[PDB]
Write a protein that binds this ligand. Structure first.
Ligand SMILES: CC(C)(c1ccc(O)cc1)c1ccc(OCc2cccc(COc3ccc(C(=N)N)cc3)c2)cc1
Length: 439
């Protein structure tokens, strides 16, 4: 088994050359030669597919070192190749953090993105990522030097003066390289999938509310004589129009002069359910029942809460728990005697109908189907191919530093096992062009 690990590491590094060199050289080409307005999503890809190219430029050296038997490029060679390799890991993973940290701001509030996602404020970030990536790989050029092993064989690897030195740096490139990003991209990218559960899949929750609360695209006066716009979005508790009108422009970022788009009315409505669902989940009485209700019957809890406020809908306890206990017919007929049913029966006869049937049958037929998922669905695979390629390597870094404080011959497998994990990761630089050729 002494011969097959070098055999495995020399094909992957060569298939990464035959696939990663041409693809990245093309991907980096189009974004420069054949484009006028380079989108922000075309710069992330650019630098990410630009950095991935530099790592592969060092591959012909490790392959030579893999077969020749000794290093051949002097202190600079092995001081450099690891620095170039160490900077792409850092640059690549931070770009993937930013890309993933951003698709959580495009759903948290899509009106701030227009005022924050500026090509001038994206380019002036890349330098930051690059600069803050050029620095975090600096220990690798201080600790990796060539040592003459035999008259005819000088090997190169990290020379750590003490094992405490080795430990922390092996841990240091794990938290910062992977664990800090893996934790960040898990908070942001799971906040989203936990945000949409309130917002409901597709636009289905919106059109339901349009029929009910009325869709108006200009500032008007509410039922109680107060300024609102859209589906009940309260602009301000204030009398003045210019105060009310200006208050809106702050939350949209553009000079509306009193008018918003069908889109702007919908995004703004999501903030009206996003913030109306925390009130539910932070409410003593309607949190438990809501958690039990399926995706369909949830929007109607969001509907009544939109209607009368949580403090008000919290009153129908006996009709509340009957839902929680999954008995609809005894909650459908029980809600029939409320003043809410009497004062407004066109919207009560259908909200209640969505409970006992658990479908959108009472509201519409075939005008709600959308593909809410955006191009970030592609952005969510280039992080997984990345994570699946870089976890094998880092667990060893994580296990060496951990097991270098207590306890050779049992650990003689790690470097033999690290060799492939370290060499497997040479394919992540060659994974974007196939994902772009996935279509
Ligand atoms: C496998 C080989 C040739 C060897 C040699 C002697 C032997 O007996 C057995 C094996 C070897 C030697 C040294 C070595 O250290 C460099 C290294 C180690 C892990 C990782 C990277 C960067 O990878 C990246 C960085 C960034 C990206 C990116 N997406 N932008 C992709 C891949 C560099 C690596 C391999």
């Amino acid at each position: 088994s002494n011969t097959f690990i070098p055999l495995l590491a020399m094909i992957l590094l060569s298939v990464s050359m035959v696939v990663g060199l041409p693809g990245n050289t093309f991907v980096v080409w189009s974004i420069l030669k054949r484009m006028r307005k380079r989108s922000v999503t075309a710069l992330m890809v650019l630098n990410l597919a630009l950095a991935d190219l530099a790592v592969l430029l060092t591959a012909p050296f490790f392959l030579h070192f893999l077969t020749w038997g000794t290093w051949s490029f002097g202190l600079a060679g092995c001081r450099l190749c690891h620095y170039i390799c160490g900077v792409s890991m850092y640059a690549s993973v931070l770009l993937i953090t930013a890309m993933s940290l951003d698709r959580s701001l495009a759903v948290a509030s899509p009106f701030l993105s227009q005022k924050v996602r500026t090509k001038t404020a994206a380019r002036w970030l890349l330098v930051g990522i690059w600069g803050a990536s050029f620095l975090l790989a600096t220990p690798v050029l201080a600790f990796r030097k060539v040592v003459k092993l035999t008259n005819e064989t000088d090997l190169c690897l990290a020379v750590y003066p003490s094992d405490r030195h080795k430990a922390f740096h092996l841990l240091f490139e794990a938290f910062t390289g992977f664990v800090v990003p893996f934790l960040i991209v898990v908070a942001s990218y799971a906040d989203i999938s936990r945000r949409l559960r309130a917002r409901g899949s597709g636009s289905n929750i919106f059109e339901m509310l349009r029929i009910d609360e009325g869709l108006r695209l200009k500032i008007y006066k509410d039922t109680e004589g107060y300024y609102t716009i859209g589906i009940g979005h309260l602009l301000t508790k204030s009398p003045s129009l210019n105060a009310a009108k200006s208050e809106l422009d702050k939350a949209i970022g553009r000079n509306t002069n009193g008018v918003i788009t069908k889109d702007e009315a919908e995004k703004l409505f999501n903030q009206d359910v996003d913030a109306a669902v925390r009130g539910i989940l932070r409410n003593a009485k309607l949190k438990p029942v809501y958690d039990s209700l399926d995706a369909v019957r949830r929007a109607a809890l969001i509907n009544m809460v939109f209607q009368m406020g949580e403090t008000g809908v919290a009153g129908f306890t006996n009709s509340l728990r009957m839902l929680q206990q999954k008995r609809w017919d005894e909650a459908a007929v029980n809600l029939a005697k409320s003043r809410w049913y009497n004062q407004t029966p066109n919207r009560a006869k259908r909200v209640i109908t969505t409970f006992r049937t658990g479908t959108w049958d009472a509201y519409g037929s075939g005008s709600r189907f959308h593909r809410r998922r955006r191009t970030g669905r592609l952005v969510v695979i280039i992080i997984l191919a990345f994570a699946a390629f870089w976890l094998p390597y880092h667990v060893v870094d994580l296990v060496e530093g951990s097991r270098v404080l207590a306890g050779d011959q049992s650990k003689q497998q790690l470097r033999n096992a690290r060799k492939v994990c370290i060499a497997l990761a040479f394919l992540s630089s060659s994974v974007n062009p196939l994902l772009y050729a996935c279509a």
